Structure 1
């Protein structure tokens, strides 16, 4: 029942109740004493950010805590924190006990077309909000396991904003767990909004197939070689609905200048109310 952690100002309490873990992260129940609203207390594994790097992140956190949109996970605050020999970055966000799209697909095996349409439209509204900030905010790591639902029949919210800074393409990655990948141009660290369109395409592909794209590869290097040569995931040919397949195809183009804009996707016949 007891508090097992606190922010310096006492606004946020940590409870010894584990919500889940995964990808350098453990998430606990917590409390905003200022509103009595329960929150998620996310503890991040530590790197060694140069204090060039650490200043960029505190700047980014300051930018991101000021944002509010119905399809973006609300972010409240971040700071460094110790227990024993471990230091971490704590991130406080709104609590989403219903979990992610990844978990949804596991539980319900398939996503029905009406749900896919509604939730993809919400993901697009979220991305459009980000891309129209001044200056634009690019997510850079959108995937089904960081898109959260408010309920099994609720709305979706984009999670993990701002965390992609810490994990560039130049950065060496152990071959363990599910292999990651990104839009082709991202590997060279020069890029823009369309990387989120490519990622959206891959999200929609996963929602339509209940498979992780490129499941046929065993490591990240294999996927790079295919993505940078325009070789699609095998799952693409398993998409049953032509209109869904066409949308995915128009998002996951190797050449960024050929990809759909967020505007054209929102205006697409598939997404009309």
Structure 2
């Protein structure tokens, strides 16, 4: 009756044949929560030939994401494996962010305004502080302007795509010294903590402030790797003259992770000051 073309296994969500966006290996359709009449994003992720072990790991992660409620985290409703009409995919139902990503929204503007930067970055930081104070802490690990989302008519900014990079990871991320047949399993382990999100946040803030992609002077990741592992900042950093924004970004992208500010230290900066209910 709704002009819907599909229903979730639970029956709770409808899919409409209305495409709202296209990213790499995913299509976002307009959906509807039949219980609340709230419009939602019905995201179809191309099957990445996942095994039975990986499918189990994401199912436990997906159940934990369902519980996250925070104003700066995109809400996660449900997920399942679909094979309708012979198309194999994973469906994710999430909160619908009508203006897409910050990367997409920023394409409409020439120069960043300081009041906008303050508002967007404060919201991102509040979402990260929420994630880092869960039990156990959640580390995003892949924060960028293309997975932070915005709703144009409110200016609400929310972090999205939690767990997506691990779910869609086609190969082992980076190359390691060794021969696979002889390499112990612990050589594939990844060592990181909350400060990887602090570093990513600083690069996001630099991108927003300068309206350009960091390290665009490098022709390939080999040069980036050599610059980054040498502690050389992106050239776009030289364009930041506002001393507060400069000191904020500097405190995030320090090479030594133990010297970076925490998310709460960043939220304490006078640049992000707001109102506390005290007058």
Q: TM-score when scaled to structure 1?
A: 0.89
Cα 1:82/1:177, change in 2 over 3 Å: farther
Cα 1:99/1:198, change in 2 over 3 Å: same
Contact 2:139–2:193 (8 Å) recurs in 1: yes
Higher mean C-alpha displacement, 113-122 vs 231-240? 231-240
Gaps of at least 5 residues in structure 2 are 273-278
- Deviations for 1:22-74, whole angstroms, at most 9, x for unmatched residues? 12211010111111111000111211222222111110000001110000001
Between the two proteins, the alignment pairs up a number of residues equal to 271
Cα 1:181/1:84, change in 2 over 3 Å: farther
Cα 1:91/1:173, change in 2 over 3 Å: farther
Contact 2:46–2:88 (8 Å) recurs in 1: yes
Corresponding residue for 1:214?
Answer: 215
The structure with the larger Rg is: 2
Q: Distance in 2 between matches of 1:176 and 1:155?
A: 44
How far residue 170 of structure 1 moved from its aligned partner, in angstroms, is: 6.1
Corresponding residue for 1:157?
Answer: 158
How far residue 220 of structure 1 moved from its aligned partner, in angstroms, is: 3.3
**Aligned-pair Cα RMSD in Å:** 5.3
Cα 1:31/1:174, change in 2 over 3 Å: farther
Q: TM-score when scaled to structure 2?
A: 0.87
Q: Distance in 2 between matches of 1:113 and 1:180?
A: 53
Q: Distance in 2 between matches of 1:170 and 1:140?
A: 16
Runs of 4 or more consecutive aligned structure 1 residues displaced over 4 Å after TM superposition: 167-170, 172-188
Contact 1:230–1:254 (8 Å) recurs in 2: yes
How far residue 83 of structure 1 moved from its aligned partner, in angstroms, is: 3.7
Q: Distance in 1 between matches of 2:154 and 2:148?
A: 14
How far residue 86 of structure 1 moved from its aligned partner, in angstroms, is: 2.8
Cα 1:178/1:147, change in 2 over 3 Å: farther
Corresponding residue for 2:276?
Answer: none
Q: Distance in 2 between matches of 1:168 and 1:226?
A: 25
Contact 2:18–2:30 (8 Å) recurs in 1: yes
